[PDB]
Design an enzyme around this catalytic site. Structure first.
Site, PDB file in Angstrom:
ATOM      1  CG  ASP A 290     111.994 -44.763  44.035  1.00 57.85           C
ATOM      2  OD1 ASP A 290     112.545 -45.340  43.167  1.00 57.85           O
ATOM      3  OD2 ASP A 290     112.551 -43.875  44.587  1.00 57.85           O
ATOM      4  CE1 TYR A 374     119.051 -41.153  45.341  1.00 53.79           C
ATOM      5  CE2 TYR A 374     119.895 -40.830  47.735  1.00 53.79           C
ATOM      6  CZ  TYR A 374     119.871 -40.497  46.309  1.00 53.79           C
ATOM      7  OH  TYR A 374     120.635 -39.446  45.790  1.00 53.79           O
TER       8      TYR A 374
HETATM    9 CU   LIG Z   1     119.259 -37.246  46.494  1.00 54.88          CU
END
Ligand SMILES: [Cu+2]
Ligand SMILES: [Cu+2]
Ligand code: NA
Ligand code: NA
Lengths: 620, 620
Positions: A290, A374
């Site tokens: 990320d 996420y």
């Molecule tokens: Cu997770």
């Protein structure tokens, strides 16, 4: 005035002007990364030279460039052409994500795959994910994204509830070509919706929660000056922001009497990797860096008062560049506030008759980012007693798949036909230490058990052992929870009043490190994640544990190459790199939206002060 | 009306009268323990019978007794004479503390030892400490305390700053003889004071802290009925109090739609031991069983609004017995309040355009106890998402010694000449489980690494394995942080909507267990502390991990004796015993009063619910 002030909109515009004037930013160029450089070692010297590092992508396929610019002097300092097949591709551009779904919608192989499943292409969303480095020779030197499909039944539907398993496509986002479409077979698309705001699913909302009001009638106890310099309860620091790393803490120091004592020169989360543990060919390539591939600061949320941050909040609104060099403000992107933190110290003494209670508090600096499904919260805490703590909060929607008919050893079942592959979330904290100055060393401290016998006749004694790490080749360390292993960063040239070196102790959570096979692609690219602690000698260009260009880069950069220099780290300018993470076997309770789970680390003073540093806290 | 209501002053007065009339409470008698008995197993028990268990000490030397009384019917149910050489001595009485210092003040050996050190006997405080069982044959069957000396320079002085090392005495508190005075040599008495309210030491108090106001304008979200029954955000439970264990939680259940679902039948901290790791003969016997020897509930603090407990606070004031059977109220001894706990769940979705944030809260039930120099806070937390957490907070003043010329492998230096011996603080949580009912089992869950090869060609896969604990002989388990080991308590007869057994997962902190040599006296008496997890079959009389009479018991009582029955625990009424603790190498910053350090454990649902249980939380 301060060299560590946040980048301003004017600085970003001036970078754009300098690059244009130099002929480096014509219409076919895109800025993939732009950030301010920290001052070199040597306080003062150059009165003030604000320098920026820029990664410049070329949409026509020409070689990208790394450029350093001085905004103060209006000059290009250096510009180097990059050979991406060797040193790695630039980070993914936001505009490249949109390309993937559009290209696939006109590809005959993709459409044939969707027709075989009776799916309408207008309802199929494609998650565009980073590619990594695997067996596909044609991907060398090309910018590739891989796409996984999800069905959205209507515009407000959560597509994550409807994965289209058995199907993956690879896309060259510069030449706009679909290189491969892989179809391993039709899986039923799970039909239950995951719409966590649908009253059909939530039921009637609770009426039982009474309000909790947190106010500060006289305002907060901290002061902000120069835009980003914080003073709070003897702490001093500067809050930075970088589009790759997110919030960065500079110059963390503690006022001990009349001395400002350094503790940490620079603190950041310098990489985070999310490797998936499903061996299906549809997902066995899936690994998110990320920080290094996507740039977490780019996707920072605007935080809403009373919802994301509660209490008397002071906001920072950092400025980043867009792909053309225009400044973009992230409004209310950083929350700062202090919080009550329970009892600090308490004692009721029988012999003296004195009853004593003091309360603790902490300063909180936080931001939240969203990358696809996420959402991650990054929290730095400073406590009255000298403790420094970091906490990551993971929430959002879990990444889904079909749940195979006969079960799975690598996927959890969340709902009928709906699976969630096992994965990890692993962070690397880069701590450029400065305990009472830059002459530091690291000791590993283990508990020592002692055998009953002479000098221990009752078999009750236990002790501890400290081992100094003297060279980089011996400074790659593993956790050992059973022996209570910690690491102490000390200054051998700065002693407390007992003539012992001052220090801070690093307390880890001792969670599992990277689980992948050591021979795997991900273990080579995320080598940092295979060990709990690394120590390097400070160097200007050793910024990230994975190297500068992570996207589609094989191994060969980052911490294993730094450590090979085998530099002296015994009483030197050193950097600690701590790996910590969560191993996520998803549970039914994580669906359809996941309650927060946390991981982190903390540093506590260890003979840094001459006595408790909170004897002067008043009785409320 | 509830069988689980707190004992009232009237009940304790009625117990006193029953004992007095029976001839069991003469002038030579003391109540060493008095507590209510839980109802026996019976999901249909209608007739209220409140029964109390009493340990009666005899100060003239007669054998003590264990008595059970029915307050409802006004009768003695049973009364048994105890053979303390066999089954252990009764808990220490508060009045025996004073006897140690008084007896030593007239012993010629003690006075001569003080005279050699030029110490005024009127200024020497003696800490009365439990004796344990060692090599002294004359102590078997006798009630012994050991004393260590500290100097108090003036009435408000902290005596802990001035240990008198090299000197220990043993006292028979029934016959009132000093049995031994051991003087191993003269150590300087450390001279610096440790008075943390002396302006000379604190300096000017901070004027920088601005207030934090936490209020609930509509009152709290929980209700209290029947004195101690709590309903909060779908949780239901009863808050008990016992003079030995402190706060006990009963009948923890969660309202899932229409059904009240049990989770834990009884939760308590059933023992806590503080073993010292200094091999000096002055202290090598030193081990506190704060729960079993001293009774932590009888030393509970009255908690002050705004200092100990901040916010909208509801207090309980439990009633205990004094040594003569009179009721004594611990005013404001238990704090209850709810707290904001940050973000619960958050996601910003690109495809649906929905931005979603919800906040978390926890219910806090706490009390604080003081035993000599240490002060401990016990905190139970209930969270919105079904998590249960316990946290111990350790503060107070560290126990001190001289710091030897030349250093020590087993003692930390805090100030010139002042040492603090190494030690641990180890707790045992007893969790009588009731996951959806009483048919439960425990599985040990380990992460499983997989090798690259067929079926895992990219070497990314990882998995997990679960091992059912079927018999008590295989249910003594150790932590393994490297493999992410957790333990799942499930109900094999209650399935969620995916047809999997409902469960809860215990997450340990994986701190070191008891460090003493396995052949030591303390390893035999605190055997529970040598392993992280024990599972037993429920039995009415298996209450404490160390047995009923811990004081001066020779060893093996409690868990090793219970486990030896090797009973079936696979789908049965079971009890989980979790050992967790802090290993304390004191630091300079712990002196002269210690900032809080914490340890604990938590339980999270694992397929207990059919989806997230907090979808009905409103936006606020
Ligand atoms: Cu997770
Ligand atoms: Cu301690
Ligand atoms: Na450094
Ligand atoms: Na049970």
């Amino acid at each position: 005035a301060s060299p560590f002030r946040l980048a301003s909109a004017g600085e970003i515009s001036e970078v754009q002007g300098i690059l244009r004037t130099a002929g480096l930013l014509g219409p076919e160029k895109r800025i993939a990364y732009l950030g301010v450089l920290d001052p070199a070692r040597g306080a003062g010297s150059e009165a003030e030279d604000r320098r920026f590092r820029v990664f410049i992508h070329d949409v026509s396929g020409a070689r990208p460039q790394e450029v350093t610019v001085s905004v103060t002097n209006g000059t290009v300092i250096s510009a180097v052409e990059l050979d991406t097949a060797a040193t790695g591709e630039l980070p993914v551009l936001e505009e490249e994500f949109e390309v993937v779904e559009q290209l696939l919608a006109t590809d005959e192989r993709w459409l044939k795959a969707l027709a075989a499943r009776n799916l309408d292409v207008s309802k199929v969303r494609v998650a565009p994910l980073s590619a990594g480095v695997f067996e596909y020779a044609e991907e060398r030197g090309r910018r590739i994204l891989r796409g996984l499909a999800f069905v959205q039944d209507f515009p407000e539907d959560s597509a994550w509830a409807h994965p289209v398993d058995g199907l993956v496509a690879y896309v060259d986002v510069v030449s706009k070509e679909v290189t491969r479409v892989i179809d391993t077979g039709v899986f039923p698309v799970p039909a239950e919706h995951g719409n966590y705001t649908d009253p059909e699913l939530t039921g009637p909302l609770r009426t039982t929660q009474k309000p909790i009001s947190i106010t500060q009638p006289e305002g907060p106890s901290f002061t902000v000056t120069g835009g980003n310099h914080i003073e709070w309860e003897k702490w001093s620091l500067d809050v930075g922001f970088d589009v790759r790393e997110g919030v960065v803490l500079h110059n963390i120091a503690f006022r001990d009497g009349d001395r400002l004592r350094p503790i940490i020169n620079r603190a950041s989360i310098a990489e985070m990797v999310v490797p998936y543990g499903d061996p299906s060919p549809i997902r066995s390539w899936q690994n998110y860096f990320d920080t290094g591939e996507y740039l977490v600061g780019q996707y920072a949320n605007s935080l809403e008062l009373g919802c994301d941050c509660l209490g008397d909040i002071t906001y920072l609104s950092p400025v980043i560049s867009d792909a053309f060099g225009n400044p973009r403000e992230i409004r209310n992107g950083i929350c700062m506030h202090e919080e009550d933190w329970g009892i600090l110290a308490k004692h009721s003494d029988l012999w003296s008759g004195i009853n004593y209670t003091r309360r603790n508090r902490r300063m909180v600096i936080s931001f939240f980012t969203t990358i696809g499904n996420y959402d991650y919260g990054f929290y730095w805490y400073l406590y009255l007693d000298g403790t420094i703590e970091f906490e990551a909060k993971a929430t959002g929607v879990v990444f889904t798949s079909a749940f195979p008919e006969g079960g799975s050893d690598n996927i959890s079942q969340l709902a009928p036909g709906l699976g969630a592959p096992f994965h990890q979330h692993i962070f690397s904290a880069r701590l450029d230490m400065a305990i009472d100055g830059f002459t530091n060393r690291v000791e590993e401290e283990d508990v020592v058990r002692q055998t009953m016998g002479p000098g221990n006749e009752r078999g009750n004694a236990f002790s501890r052992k400290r081992t100094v790490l003297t060279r980089e080749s011996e400074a790659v360390r593993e956790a050992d929870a059973r022996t209570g292993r910690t690491w102490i960063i000390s200054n051998p040239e700065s002693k407390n009043r007992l003539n012992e070196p001052v220090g801070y102790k690093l307390h880890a959570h001792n969670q599992p490190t990277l689980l992948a096979d050591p021979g795997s692609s991900i273990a080579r690219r995320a080598a940092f994640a295979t060990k709990d602690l690394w120590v390097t000698r400070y160097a200007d260009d050793e910024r990230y544990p994975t190297g500068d260009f992570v996207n589609q880069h094989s191994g060969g950069a980052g911490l294993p190459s730094y450590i090979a220099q085998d530099r002296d780290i015994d009483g030197q300018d050193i950097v600690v790199w701590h790996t910590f993470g969560l191993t996520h076997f998803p549970r039914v309770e994580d669906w359809p939206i996941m309650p927060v789970d946390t991981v982190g680390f903390k540093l506590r003073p260890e003979g840094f002060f001459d006595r408790s540093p909170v004897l002067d806290v008043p009785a409320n």
